[PDB]
Amino acid sequence: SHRKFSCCRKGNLGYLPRKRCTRGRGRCKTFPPDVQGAPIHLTAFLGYKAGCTHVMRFIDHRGSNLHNRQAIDQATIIDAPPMICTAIIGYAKTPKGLRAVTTVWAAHIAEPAMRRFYRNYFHAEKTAFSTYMKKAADGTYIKEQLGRLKQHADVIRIVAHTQPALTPLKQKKADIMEIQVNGGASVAEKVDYAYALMEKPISIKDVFSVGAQIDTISITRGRGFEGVVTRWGVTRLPRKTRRGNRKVACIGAWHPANVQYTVARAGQMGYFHRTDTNKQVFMIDTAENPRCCTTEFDLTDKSINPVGGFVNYGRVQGDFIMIKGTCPGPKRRPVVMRNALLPHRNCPPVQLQWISTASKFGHGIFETVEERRQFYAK
Amino acid sequence: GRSGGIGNKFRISCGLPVGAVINCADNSGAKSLNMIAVKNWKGHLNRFPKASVGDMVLITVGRDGKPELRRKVTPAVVVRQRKVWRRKDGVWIYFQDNAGVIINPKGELKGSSITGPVAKEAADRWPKISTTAECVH
Amino acid sequence: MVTTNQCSYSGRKILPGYGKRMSRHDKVLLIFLNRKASVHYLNKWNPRKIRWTLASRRARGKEV
RNA sequence: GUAACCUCGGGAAAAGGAGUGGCUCUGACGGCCGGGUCAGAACUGGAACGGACGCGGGGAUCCCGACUGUUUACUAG
RNA sequence: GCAUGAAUGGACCAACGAGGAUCCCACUGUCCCGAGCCGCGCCUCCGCGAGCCUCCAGCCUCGGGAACGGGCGAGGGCCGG
RNA sequence: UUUGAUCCUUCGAUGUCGGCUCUUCCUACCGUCCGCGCGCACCGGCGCGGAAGCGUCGGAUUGUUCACCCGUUCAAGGGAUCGUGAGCUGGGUUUAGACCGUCGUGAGACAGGUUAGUUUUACCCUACUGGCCCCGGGGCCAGAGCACGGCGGGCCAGUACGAGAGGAACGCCCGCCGCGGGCCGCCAGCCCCGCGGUUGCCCGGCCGGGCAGCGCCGCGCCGCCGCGCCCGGGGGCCCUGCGCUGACCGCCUCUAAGCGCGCACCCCGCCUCGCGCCCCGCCCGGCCGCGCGCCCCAGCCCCGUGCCCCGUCGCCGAGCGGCCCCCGCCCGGGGAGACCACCCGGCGCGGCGCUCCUGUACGGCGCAGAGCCCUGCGAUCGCCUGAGGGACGCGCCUGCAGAGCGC
Ligand SMILES: [K+]
Ligand SMILES: [K+]
Ligand SMILES: [K+]
Ligand SMILES: [K+]
Ligand SMILES: [K+]
Ligand SMILES: [Mg+2]
Ligand SMILES: [Mg+2]
Ligand SMILES: [Mg+2]
Ligand SMILES: [Mg+2]
Ligand SMILES: [Mg+2]
Ligand SMILES: [Mg+2]
Ligand SMILES: [Mg+2]
Ligand SMILES: [Mg+2]
Ligand SMILES: [Mg+2]
Ligand SMILES: [Mg+2]
Ligand SMILES: [Mg+2]
Ligand SMILES: [Mg+2]
Ligand SMILES: [Mg+2]
Ligand SMILES: [Mg+2]
Ligand SMILES: [Mg+2]
Ligand SMILES: [Mg+2]
Ligand SMILES: [Mg+2]
Ligand SMILES: [Mg+2]
Ligand SMILES: [Mg+2]
Ligand SMILES: [Mg+2]
Ligand SMILES: [Mg+2]
Ligand SMILES: [Mg+2]
Ligand SMILES: [Mg+2]
Ligand code: NA
Ligand code: NA
Ligand code: NA
Ligand code: NA
Ligand code: NA
Ligand code: NA
Ligand code: NA
Ligand code: NA
């Protein structure tokens, strides 16, 4: 007979199966669409999650109760040391989909990439690219391959890698990513632009801008094996139940004589590949600037690094980006940033007035160590 | 043709589910009020309706109040609550007791004066409360 | 930010978005720095004998 | 400080209030030196003291059997 | 008064009851709506080491059929452990 | 989806009502969507067709299904062994105790009422949820899954409309609710052995400790978490229809050929998984095969052929196309975790500094101290002292150390 009262199912069936991610890191499945004639630009970057904090801003939002006053907002900091371009890959559109044409590697490759090619660098015999680097000493081979790409490709991407030596991480091998080149008037313009920045650093300042929106892709926090109450959010059973009350009472009808895939069961929770969309950029700066986080209402110079350090993360050494809200993952998890595909239309402009830099280790009340020393008669 | 509160409010942390007994902050003759319903509430299976400061509820007057109002369902507005809530400017605030005032659907009070401080949400949403209030926090 | 408040119980400085405030029936607004302060006040512990507060340091002469 | 009712014996710990630590003192009660108990005061501790332990929740009514007692060892007190 | 009723006892009743029932105060994870934690088991290892059950076997949908098939007819899937 | 009629299967047993929990399906559609009609001025109602995406709630009495009432964003109906007892519960029904009424000579009876009354076993097969049976880096894609709906406010406007009472709509902007995926900066909750307070006993006393299965009380870091915060704006083909051009049928006709517009439904994108493939690197290898005009059929451009020997005697080269081969662990640490796997590695131990948790150490010194049997006893208080103790976060190394066996 029919269920007496109305209620929806619990959980989203579009995120199945709930299994540990088998991809090494967060990967960019799709890139923003390419429109001919727009200025040529890059579409993505890779960084590391560092922390969260406060900001006070001024809201100019016509038609809302916030239109002429202040608001306290949550922000997230992502550490973005420069990336090195090192290869060019071209694709051709085909009846079978996107097929690679060829990939051309630079004459000289840095140690982090070489490390990425092995499992144990100290013991491994160093043979990767040993023959290739002799062939490509002169520019002739590179030119021939780029001519091939110019005459046969439809989509152009570059290959860049991170520099973990500029971070507090323990890892020494780098992360290799493909980044698409959008814009221009033809494929030749794209190929020349990509060739103009080979073996060169790329800064996040040249990819994103303040006030635009981005998508973030990462892997969420892990929890191991978990029960239905926490894994799927079903109701607990009453106290008098024999054999406990954290479970689903009925897991099916008599017919069909099987268990359906739509019924909640226990298993792995967390460590999933996820993507949050439409996050607004608040600030792009570098930790090498002493007035990094000083505004019109402040006096003493304050930088990004808080008093006592970023908890469970080293100190930030260089460039970084600030976004509004939250992103998946814990601290130190690699994060891929990407231009938004379907941005939100009505976003008020960003107008920072004050940034909180107190100690997040405990409850701190001093924005700088000099103020603390003054206070404690030190 | 003006019936309800003014403007559209922001979501606030509710603290008063159906079945709570709250104090009467106006000199209408009542001592305590029993909450039995919330206006503009769409439910869910098994979930009690709940209210916060500034919204309209339906009450009965308790056994320790003047008999002239003792067996009717009446509207009222919540003006104070003990559950701490956060405002859009990042301020967390709370009061010492839960309290309300008997008001009309169109918005005229049923007493002369309101005793104690009143939250700014209720005052902004209802003009009659704003003037009769002696202190707004 | 220039505009900061003072804790009602301990006399320390509070930064934007960092505590809770209470309104009493007598129409007085109290501002607290953390949960430790608000518990001290709620229990009616005299701040003049809690040695880390400003009220106590003034009575001792350490603070002028 | 304790009500209705009552077989005048009860109800009754009805209901419901306040106090209780430490230290320094004062008085009272025997015997031709001992002993504990009871009462009062100052000072002083995060507005704390039956600080662990041990140890009634209460009230207004209706039905049945007066009451203490006995019973289906192993589903009925 | 389907079909109450007088030692097959009628009516009433203070005290009493691990008896059946309704309401009020106080109290609370019973609940809104769940969260965090402690010990033991579970789990992995060394040593020791059973019972029950068992035509044969062990993926589905429809048909017909002792009228609700694992095997039969027609289709759809599936390395093995 | 009722109740009957019948007696085909099941008495060497298919656990017999309802509720709670959870999934899926139907449409004969209650609100929301798109059209048409009205005895449709507006507001509000009523009828018809397509449409099953979302919504269909909280309570009082009853074991109840049902019914009945209060309230709210005003509240359709059903199926799945009358879905769901090795999922629960045990209120009802339906053993054995006991009571009332009616019936019976009696033992006893009663689709009459009432009260008390053990709910056993998974370690096997399958299904389901996760996890494994090592092999480079970066990508692509078949197949499978699938997720943005509802209610308001402001401007339009006291306008159109209407005698008046009254009283809309397109578009844009701003909110709320329900659902979904994340996160910890603020606030809230929690405490592994941190700090402080306190009762009894025990270590002769002070100090400092132990036992009371964490003695009990306050606060609390890294972390987890909600009662906190962030995020959710795309296309296509078209049904039921409304139109354009226009005949059979001299006229008229949305249709018969032809053409346009079109739905919370359908399909695709985004989003989750993903066998297999591709590029590159180390290498530059081995094998197999021999054969290209296009377009239309009421112009069909002169047709109504050709091949017909894959050995049956064909087999070089080139060219073009296709296939095959190629890639470590043990060990330690986590941001990962049942075991495994995954991500990373010249690890870590022990210190020093910063930060922040508690709340001002022991000792000494005081004309401090209520008082006293007073050249001494005394709970407490002040100063040295935001002190002492602690750290699972951050920064350094002045010490000790850390790259070794099976394949
Ligand atoms: K349903
Ligand atoms: K008894
Ligand atoms: K049978
Ligand atoms: K049952
Ligand atoms: K904590
Ligand atoms: Mg039980
Ligand atoms: Mg912190
Ligand atoms: Mg319910
Ligand atoms: Mg008796
Ligand atoms: Mg007895
Ligand atoms: Mg017995
Ligand atoms: Mg018994
Ligand atoms: Mg008779
Ligand atoms: Mg007689
Ligand atoms: Mg009789
Ligand atoms: Mg069988
Ligand atoms: Mg067969
Ligand atoms: Mg069975
Ligand atoms: Mg059986
Ligand atoms: Mg139909
Ligand atoms: Mg069963
Ligand atoms: Mg029973
Ligand atoms: Mg019986
Ligand atoms: Mg599997
Ligand atoms: Mg698909
Ligand atoms: Mg907290
Ligand atoms: Mg002992
Ligand atoms: Mg972990
Ligand atoms: Na079947
Ligand atoms: Na049936
Ligand atoms: Na059934
Ligand atoms: Na059972
Ligand atoms: Na086991
Ligand atoms: Na002790
Ligand atoms: Na979507
Ligand atoms: Na001392």
Side-chain angles (χ1 to χ4, degrees), chain A residues 113-132:
Chain A
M114 296 315 216
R115 290 187 98 104
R116 175 51 69 171
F117 296 145
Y118 306 93
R119 250 297 288 154
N120 189 293
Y121 202 56
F122 189 68
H123 290 292
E125 324 315 346
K126 312 297 170 55
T127 52
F129 288 93
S130 60
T131 301
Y132 176 87

PDB file of all heavy atoms in Angstrom, chain A residues 113-132:
ATOM      1  N   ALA A 113      60.085  18.749 -12.276  1.00  0.00           N
ATOM      2  CA  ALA A 113      59.414  17.903 -13.260  1.00  0.00           C
ATOM      3  C   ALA A 113      60.108  16.549 -13.382  1.00  0.00           C
ATOM      4  O   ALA A 113      59.460  15.490 -13.329  1.00  0.00           O
ATOM      5  CB  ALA A 113      59.362  18.614 -14.611  1.00  0.00           C
ATOM      6  N   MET A 114      61.432  16.564 -13.531  1.00  0.00           N
ATOM      7  CA  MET A 114      62.181  15.317 -13.567  1.00  0.00           C
ATOM      8  C   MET A 114      61.827  14.443 -12.377  1.00  0.00           C
ATOM      9  O   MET A 114      61.623  13.235 -12.522  1.00  0.00           O
ATOM     10  CB  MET A 114      63.678  15.609 -13.590  1.00  0.00           C
ATOM     11  CG  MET A 114      64.134  16.343 -14.820  1.00  0.00           C
ATOM     12  SD  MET A 114      63.431  15.669 -16.328  1.00  0.00           S
ATOM     13  CE  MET A 114      64.802  15.890 -17.453  1.00  0.00           C
ATOM     14  N   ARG A 115      61.734  15.041 -11.192  1.00  0.00           N
ATOM     15  CA  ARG A 115      61.336  14.285 -10.014  1.00  0.00           C
ATOM     16  C   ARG A 115      59.947  13.698 -10.193  1.00  0.00           C
ATOM     17  O   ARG A 115      59.694  12.550  -9.814  1.00  0.00           O
ATOM     18  CB  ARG A 115      61.382  15.180  -8.782  1.00  0.00           C
ATOM     19  CG  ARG A 115      62.767  15.566  -8.360  1.00  0.00           C
ATOM     20  CD  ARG A 115      62.740  16.311  -7.049  1.00  0.00           C
ATOM     21  NE  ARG A 115      63.040  15.426  -5.934  1.00  0.00           N
ATOM     22  CZ  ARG A 115      64.198  15.400  -5.295  1.00  0.00           C
ATOM     23  NH1 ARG A 115      65.187  16.210  -5.625  1.00  0.00           N
ATOM     24  NH2 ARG A 115      64.370  14.537  -4.302  1.00  0.00           N
ATOM     25  N   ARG A 116      59.028  14.477 -10.764  1.00  0.00           N
ATOM     26  CA  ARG A 116      57.687  13.965 -11.020  1.00  0.00           C
ATOM     27  C   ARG A 116      57.723  12.726 -11.902  1.00  0.00           C
ATOM     28  O   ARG A 116      56.813  11.895 -11.837  1.00  0.00           O
ATOM     29  CB  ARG A 116      56.820  15.053 -11.656  1.00  0.00           C
ATOM     30  CG  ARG A 116      55.418  14.620 -12.101  1.00  0.00           C
ATOM     31  CD  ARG A 116      54.645  13.889 -11.021  1.00  0.00           C
ATOM     32  NE  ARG A 116      54.266  14.757  -9.913  1.00  0.00           N
ATOM     33  CZ  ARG A 116      53.442  14.408  -8.936  1.00  0.00           C
ATOM     34  NH1 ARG A 116      52.866  13.219  -8.908  1.00  0.00           N
ATOM     35  NH2 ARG A 116      53.188  15.273  -7.961  1.00  0.00           N
ATOM     36  N   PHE A 117      58.762  12.576 -12.723  1.00  0.00           N
ATOM     37  CA  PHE A 117      58.815  11.417 -13.615  1.00  0.00           C
ATOM     38  C   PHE A 117      59.252  10.118 -12.942  1.00  0.00           C
ATOM     39  O   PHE A 117      59.126   9.059 -13.562  1.00  0.00           O
ATOM     40  CB  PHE A 117      59.740  11.693 -14.800  1.00  0.00           C
ATOM     41  CG  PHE A 117      59.262  12.793 -15.681  1.00  0.00           C
ATOM     42  CD1 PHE A 117      60.155  13.641 -16.298  1.00  0.00           C
ATOM     43  CD2 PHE A 117      57.912  12.994 -15.878  1.00  0.00           C
ATOM     44  CE1 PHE A 117      59.713  14.661 -17.101  1.00  0.00           C
ATOM     45  CE2 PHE A 117      57.468  14.016 -16.682  1.00  0.00           C
ATOM     46  CZ  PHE A 117      58.369  14.850 -17.292  1.00  0.00           C
ATOM     47  N   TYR A 118      59.759  10.151 -11.714  1.00  0.00           N
ATOM     48  CA  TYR A 118      60.222   8.947 -11.031  1.00  0.00           C
ATOM     49  C   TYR A 118      59.446   8.733  -9.738  1.00  0.00           C
ATOM     50  O   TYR A 118      58.636   9.564  -9.325  1.00  0.00           O
ATOM     51  CB  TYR A 118      61.720   9.024 -10.718  1.00  0.00           C
ATOM     52  CG  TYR A 118      62.583   9.322 -11.910  1.00  0.00           C
ATOM     53  CD1 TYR A 118      62.944  10.618 -12.219  1.00  0.00           C
ATOM     54  CD2 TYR A 118      63.036   8.306 -12.733  1.00  0.00           C
ATOM     55  CE1 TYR A 118      63.728  10.895 -13.310  1.00  0.00           C
ATOM     56  CE2 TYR A 118      63.822   8.575 -13.825  1.00  0.00           C
ATOM     57  CZ  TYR A 118      64.163   9.870 -14.108  1.00  0.00           C
ATOM     58  OH  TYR A 118      64.949  10.147 -15.196  1.00  0.00           O
ATOM     59  N   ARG A 119      59.706   7.599  -9.094  1.00  0.00           N
ATOM     60  CA  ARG A 119      59.151   7.306  -7.778  1.00  0.00           C
ATOM     61  C   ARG A 119      60.141   7.545  -6.652  1.00  0.00           C
ATOM     62  O   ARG A 119      59.749   8.012  -5.582  1.00  0.00           O
ATOM     63  CB  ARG A 119      58.657   5.860  -7.708  1.00  0.00           C
ATOM     64  CG  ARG A 119      57.146   5.730  -7.642  1.00  0.00           C
ATOM     65  CD  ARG A 119      56.576   6.366  -6.380  1.00  0.00           C
ATOM     66  NE  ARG A 119      56.874   5.593  -5.182  1.00  0.00           N
ATOM     67  CZ  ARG A 119      56.958   6.104  -3.960  1.00  0.00           C
ATOM     68  NH1 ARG A 119      56.772   7.393  -3.733  1.00  0.00           N
ATOM     69  NH2 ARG A 119      57.238   5.299  -2.941  1.00  0.00           N
ATOM     70  N   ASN A 120      61.415   7.226  -6.858  1.00  0.00           N
ATOM     71  CA  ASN A 120      62.463   7.493  -5.878  1.00  0.00           C
ATOM     72  C   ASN A 120      63.642   8.080  -6.646  1.00  0.00           C
ATOM     73  O   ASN A 120      64.358   7.361  -7.348  1.00  0.00           O
ATOM     74  CB  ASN A 120      62.848   6.230  -5.119  1.00  0.00           C
ATOM     75  CG  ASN A 120      63.775   6.508  -3.961  1.00  0.00           C
ATOM     76  OD1 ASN A 120      64.919   6.915  -4.145  1.00  0.00           O
ATOM     77  ND2 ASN A 120      63.277   6.305  -2.753  1.00  0.00           N
ATOM     78  N   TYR A 121      63.828   9.392  -6.521  1.00  0.00           N
ATOM     79  CA  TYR A 121      64.813  10.088  -7.340  1.00  0.00           C
ATOM     80  C   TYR A 121      66.233   9.634  -7.025  1.00  0.00           C
ATOM     81  O   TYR A 121      67.055   9.481  -7.933  1.00  0.00           O
ATOM     82  CB  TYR A 121      64.672  11.592  -7.136  1.00  0.00           C
ATOM     83  CG  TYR A 121      65.223  12.421  -8.263  1.00  0.00           C
ATOM     84  CD1 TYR A 121      64.781  12.236  -9.560  1.00  0.00           C
ATOM     85  CD2 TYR A 121      66.171  13.399  -8.027  1.00  0.00           C
ATOM     86  CE1 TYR A 121      65.275  12.993 -10.590  1.00  0.00           C
ATOM     87  CE2 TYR A 121      66.670  14.158  -9.048  1.00  0.00           C
ATOM     88  CZ  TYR A 121      66.216  13.953 -10.329  1.00  0.00           C
ATOM     89  OH  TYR A 121      66.715  14.711 -11.358  1.00  0.00           O
ATOM     90  N   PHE A 122      66.541   9.418  -5.747  1.00  0.00           N
ATOM     91  CA  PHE A 122      67.917   9.129  -5.357  1.00  0.00           C
ATOM     92  C   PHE A 122      68.417   7.830  -5.977  1.00  0.00           C
ATOM     93  O   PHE A 122      69.569   7.747  -6.413  1.00  0.00           O
ATOM     94  CB  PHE A 122      68.023   9.078  -3.833  1.00  0.00           C
ATOM     95  CG  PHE A 122      69.428   9.008  -3.325  1.00  0.00           C
ATOM     96  CD1 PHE A 122      70.284  10.078  -3.476  1.00  0.00           C
ATOM     97  CD2 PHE A 122      69.894   7.871  -2.700  1.00  0.00           C
ATOM     98  CE1 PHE A 122      71.576  10.012  -3.011  1.00  0.00           C
ATOM     99  CE2 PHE A 122      71.182   7.802  -2.237  1.00  0.00           C
ATOM    100  CZ  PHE A 122      72.023   8.875  -2.390  1.00  0.00           C
ATOM    101  N   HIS A 123      67.572   6.804  -6.018  1.00  0.00           N
ATOM    102  CA  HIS A 123      67.983   5.515  -6.557  1.00  0.00           C
ATOM    103  C   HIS A 123      67.725   5.383  -8.049  1.00  0.00           C
ATOM    104  O   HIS A 123      68.450   4.655  -8.732  1.00  0.00           O
ATOM    105  CB  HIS A 123      67.261   4.383  -5.825  1.00  0.00           C
ATOM    106  CG  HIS A 123      67.704   4.204  -4.409  1.00  0.00           C
ATOM    107  ND1 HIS A 123      68.957   3.743  -4.074  1.00  0.00           N
ATOM    108  CD2 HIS A 123      67.061   4.431  -3.240  1.00  0.00           C
ATOM    109  CE1 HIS A 123      69.069   3.694  -2.759  1.00  0.00           C
ATOM    110  NE2 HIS A 123      67.932   4.105  -2.229  1.00  0.00           N
ATOM    111  N   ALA A 124      66.715   6.070  -8.570  1.00  0.00           N
ATOM    112  CA  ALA A 124      66.316   5.874  -9.955  1.00  0.00           C
ATOM    113  C   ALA A 124      67.401   6.341 -10.912  1.00  0.00           C
ATOM    114  O   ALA A 124      68.013   7.395 -10.722  1.00  0.00           O
ATOM    115  CB  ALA A 124      65.017   6.623 -10.241  1.00  0.00           C
ATOM    116  N   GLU A 125      67.633   5.543 -11.953  1.00  0.00           N
ATOM    117  CA  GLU A 125      68.538   5.935 -13.024  1.00  0.00           C
ATOM    118  C   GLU A 125      67.932   7.071 -13.835  1.00  0.00           C
ATOM    119  O   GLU A 125      66.748   7.049 -14.176  1.00  0.00           O
ATOM    120  CB  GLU A 125      68.833   4.742 -13.930  1.00  0.00           C
ATOM    121  CG  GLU A 125      68.933   3.410 -13.200  1.00  0.00           C
ATOM    122  CD  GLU A 125      69.761   3.490 -11.928  1.00  0.00           C
ATOM    123  OE1 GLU A 125      70.480   4.491 -11.739  1.00  0.00           O
ATOM    124  OE2 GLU A 125      69.687   2.550 -11.111  1.00  0.00           O
ATOM    125  N   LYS A 126      68.758   8.063 -14.158  1.00  0.00           N
ATOM    126  CA  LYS A 126      68.279   9.316 -14.738  1.00  0.00           C
ATOM    127  C   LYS A 126      68.336   9.211 -16.255  1.00  0.00           C
ATOM    128  O   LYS A 126      69.331   9.565 -16.887  1.00  0.00           O
ATOM    129  CB  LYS A 126      69.110  10.483 -14.224  1.00  0.00           C
ATOM    130  CG  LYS A 126      69.298  10.497 -12.716  1.00  0.00           C
ATOM    131  CD  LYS A 126      67.973  10.658 -11.992  1.00  0.00           C
ATOM    132  CE  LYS A 126      68.128  10.430 -10.501  1.00  0.00           C
ATOM    133  NZ  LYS A 126      69.166  11.297  -9.899  1.00  0.00           N
ATOM    134  N   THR A 127      67.245   8.741 -16.857  1.00  0.00           N
ATOM    135  CA  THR A 127      67.206   8.538 -18.297  1.00  0.00           C
ATOM    136  C   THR A 127      66.105   9.303 -19.015  1.00  0.00           C
ATOM    137  O   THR A 127      66.169   9.422 -20.242  1.00  0.00           O
ATOM    138  CB  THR A 127      67.057   7.045 -18.628  1.00  0.00           C
ATOM    139  OG1 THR A 127      65.953   6.496 -17.900  1.00  0.00           O
ATOM    140  CG2 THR A 127      68.324   6.294 -18.269  1.00  0.00           C
ATOM    141  N   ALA A 128      65.109   9.825 -18.306  1.00  0.00           N
ATOM    142  CA  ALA A 128      64.015  10.516 -18.970  1.00  0.00           C
ATOM    143  C   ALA A 128      64.535  11.708 -19.759  1.00  0.00           C
ATOM    144  O   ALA A 128      65.293  12.531 -19.241  1.00  0.00           O
ATOM    145  CB  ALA A 128      62.978  10.971 -17.947  1.00  0.00           C
ATOM    146  N   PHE A 129      64.116  11.798 -21.017  1.00  0.00           N
ATOM    147  CA  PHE A 129      64.458  12.875 -21.942  1.00  0.00           C
ATOM    148  C   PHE A 129      65.945  12.951 -22.257  1.00  0.00           C
ATOM    149  O   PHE A 129      66.401  13.961 -22.796  1.00  0.00           O
ATOM    150  CB  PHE A 129      63.984  14.233 -21.425  1.00  0.00           C
ATOM    151  CG  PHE A 129      62.505  14.419 -21.491  1.00  0.00           C
ATOM    152  CD1 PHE A 129      61.707  14.106 -20.410  1.00  0.00           C
ATOM    153  CD2 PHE A 129      61.913  14.932 -22.624  1.00  0.00           C
ATOM    154  CE1 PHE A 129      60.346  14.283 -20.471  1.00  0.00           C
ATOM    155  CE2 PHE A 129      60.555  15.102 -22.688  1.00  0.00           C
ATOM    156  CZ  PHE A 129      59.772  14.782 -21.608  1.00  0.00           C
ATOM    157  N   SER A 130      66.719  11.913 -21.942  1.00  0.00           N
ATOM    158  CA  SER A 130      68.157  11.987 -22.173  1.00  0.00           C
ATOM    159  C   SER A 130      68.480  12.083 -23.660  1.00  0.00           C
ATOM    160  O   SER A 130      69.356  12.858 -24.061  1.00  0.00           O
ATOM    161  CB  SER A 130      68.859  10.792 -21.533  1.00  0.00           C
ATOM    162  OG  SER A 130      68.387   9.571 -22.064  1.00  0.00           O
ATOM    163  N   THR A 131      67.791  11.306 -24.497  1.00  0.00           N
ATOM    164  CA  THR A 131      68.001  11.421 -25.937  1.00  0.00           C
ATOM    165  C   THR A 131      67.360  12.685 -26.493  1.00  0.00           C
ATOM    166  O   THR A 131      67.917  13.326 -27.389  1.00  0.00           O
ATOM    167  CB  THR A 131      67.446  10.194 -26.659  1.00  0.00           C
ATOM    168  OG1 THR A 131      68.097   9.012 -26.181  1.00  0.00           O
ATOM    169  CG2 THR A 131      67.669  10.312 -28.148  1.00  0.00           C
ATOM    170  N   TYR A 132      66.186  13.054 -25.983  1.00  0.00           N
ATOM    171  CA  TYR A 132      65.464  14.189 -26.545  1.00  0.00           C
ATOM    172  C   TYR A 132      66.244  15.486 -26.384  1.00  0.00           C
ATOM    173  O   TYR A 132      66.288  16.306 -27.306  1.00  0.00           O
ATOM    174  CB  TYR A 132      64.090  14.308 -25.893  1.00  0.00           C
ATOM    175  CG  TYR A 132      63.304  15.513 -26.346  1.00  0.00           C
ATOM    176  CD1 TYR A 132      62.514  15.463 -27.478  1.00  0.00           C
ATOM    177  CD2 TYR A 132      63.357  16.703 -25.640  1.00  0.00           C
ATOM    178  CE1 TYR A 132      61.800  16.558 -27.892  1.00  0.00           C
ATOM    179  CE2 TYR A 132      62.647  17.796 -26.047  1.00  0.00           C
ATOM    180  CZ  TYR A 132      61.873  17.722 -27.174  1.00  0.00           C
ATOM    181  OH  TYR A 132      61.164  18.820 -27.583  1.00  0.00           O
TER     182      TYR A 132
END
